[PDB]
């Protein structure tokens, strides 16, 4: 009755698989393992969708045994916020492009929230939206799917036979040869069987942004850097709200050179000092520099595919990364490196880093982090550990010296120190360094502060304050770094949209990220899911939405 039924005989294939020299072996036995799993007496039959959950990219609910008969069937056991579960919607998005609904394949994402906030029906359609998901989609809010499989890992695959007969199950993320090897095979078995039909299943406004990540301040000039990461582009914008430069989109790339050539593809973080831009280009897996005063954009640093190097070391364009999403100038550009769990470095000039040697220009590793995700504090940057590090802000002065990391999936923020490179907690989360799960919404001291996925944090060296961006409680907060209090300084906490209003009064909806202007005024907010930039006055506490045409 659960995914415990196939992993005796699945690993014995998986064994054999590794002592397979040619790919015919290898698909030989994947015939037998389905030959063998086929011809069961008693199948591992899947569970039918519970009735009445809500359902996305289709006209009516689907069930497995009315509508999914003939069909090999991939269930993705996924949520939004996990950054492997977005690791895996390339493989299932070019599996969809190889196999339709007529060659006898659907994919199914069974969304199974993590945390509160992803239950809610209209924040997984914007992010439907957001990472461009084109197949069937059911709200398995309570994850009834989940615990009857003993599904424990996100993102889990399950493949499904003809009958609803589970076949395969593969855990976690980059199992994309396997993947195909298992669903190509499984097609060709059942089709010999004459088991798979042909039949077809039924499935399916111009803002002038859309879905923003993130927005930056020049301290000089007092201009925004918006990430309009939906637009797949960067908007260099003056402090009323007129657009100096657009660069990028409408649609994805990797393309250098001129304003007009270049492309981007769902860019997060921005930094800028000198008229020089750097980009963290998340699903290109690349940084990119735009240059104001010369008018080119350029890479520098990414191989423009998912890295799996946890160390680093290799100069910018043969250093591979993993989904970065913040940056911030120290001479040095930091990036939070969620897609490893650990905070990088690229070296712009040859430099030198806490707790380690002279790096020559160019030169792009890990700072901190060990590459596995925990909410783990530790004195050596090496064994510390991050979880989905989304957003930096740094507070060079003393007596901080720090860099302040939104931690996303702890549901924490962190100092990482600039001195030593001591990796130390600040407010949310639990003690326990495995707990991911330690998320709410309560204003309070260290470890008694609860906070739901912050993506942004921003200092404020006038005040001694850091504002973050806690995302998925709706809600800008405050931290005093002395004290370690954190409260809550605008939001409702609900997401029904408000333009002009009091900071106590007004609202936002899964803010990415923002940053304080020079004067420490005004408290820029990239409110994503609003399509809208907030401006946040903390003299009169008064918000307002920033015009721009």
Known sequence: ?????????????????????????????????????????????????????????????????????????????????????????????????????????????????????????????????????????????????????????????????????????????????????????????????????????????????????????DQVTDRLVIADTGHHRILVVWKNGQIQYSIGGPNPGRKDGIFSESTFNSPQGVAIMNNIIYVADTENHLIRKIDLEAEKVSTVAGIGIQGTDKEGGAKGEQQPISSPWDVVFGDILW?????????????????????????????????????????RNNAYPHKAGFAQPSGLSLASEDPWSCLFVADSESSTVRTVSLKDGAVKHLVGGERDPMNLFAFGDVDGVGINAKLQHPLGVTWDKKRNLLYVADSYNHKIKVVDPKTKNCTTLAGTGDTNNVTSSSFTESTFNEPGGLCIGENGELLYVADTNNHQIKVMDLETKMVSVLPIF
């Open 1 to 217: 009755r659960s995914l415990s039924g196939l992993l005796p005989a699945q690993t014995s294939l998986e064994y054999a698989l590794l002592d397979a020299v040619t790919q015919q072996e290898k698909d030989s036995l994947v015939y037998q393992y389905l030959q063998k799993v086929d011809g069961w007496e008693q199948d591992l039959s899947v569970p039918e969708f519970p009735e009445g959950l809500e359902w996305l990219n289709t006209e009516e609910p689907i069930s497995v045994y009315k509508d999914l008969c003939g069909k090999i069937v991939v269930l993705d056991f996924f949520t939004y916020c996990c950054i492997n579960c977005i690791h895996l919607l390339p493989d299932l998005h070019a599996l969809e492009h190889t196999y339709s609904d007529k060659d006898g394949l659907l994919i199914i994402g069974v969304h199974s929230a993590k945390f509160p906030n992803e239950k809610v029906l209209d924040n997984i359609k914007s992010a439907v939206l957001r990472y461009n998901i084109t197949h069937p989609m059911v709200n398995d809010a309570d994850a009834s799917l989940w615990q009857e499989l003993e599904v424990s890992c996100w993102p889990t695959l399950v493949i499904l036979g003809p009958r609803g007969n589970m076949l395969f199950s593969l855990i976690g993320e980059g199992h994309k040869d396997k993947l195909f090897l298992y669903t190509s095979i499984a097609l060709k078995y059942y089709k010999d069987r004459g088991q798979i039909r042909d039949n077809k299943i039924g499935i399916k406004p111009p803002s002038p942004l859309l879905f923003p990540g993130k927005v930056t301040v």
């Open 335 to 375: 990036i939070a490196m969620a897609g490893t769990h650990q905070i990088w470095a690229l070296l712009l000039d040859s430099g030198k880093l806490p707790k380690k040697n002279e790096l020559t220009k160019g030169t792009c590793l890990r700072f901190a982090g060990s590459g596995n995700e925990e909410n």
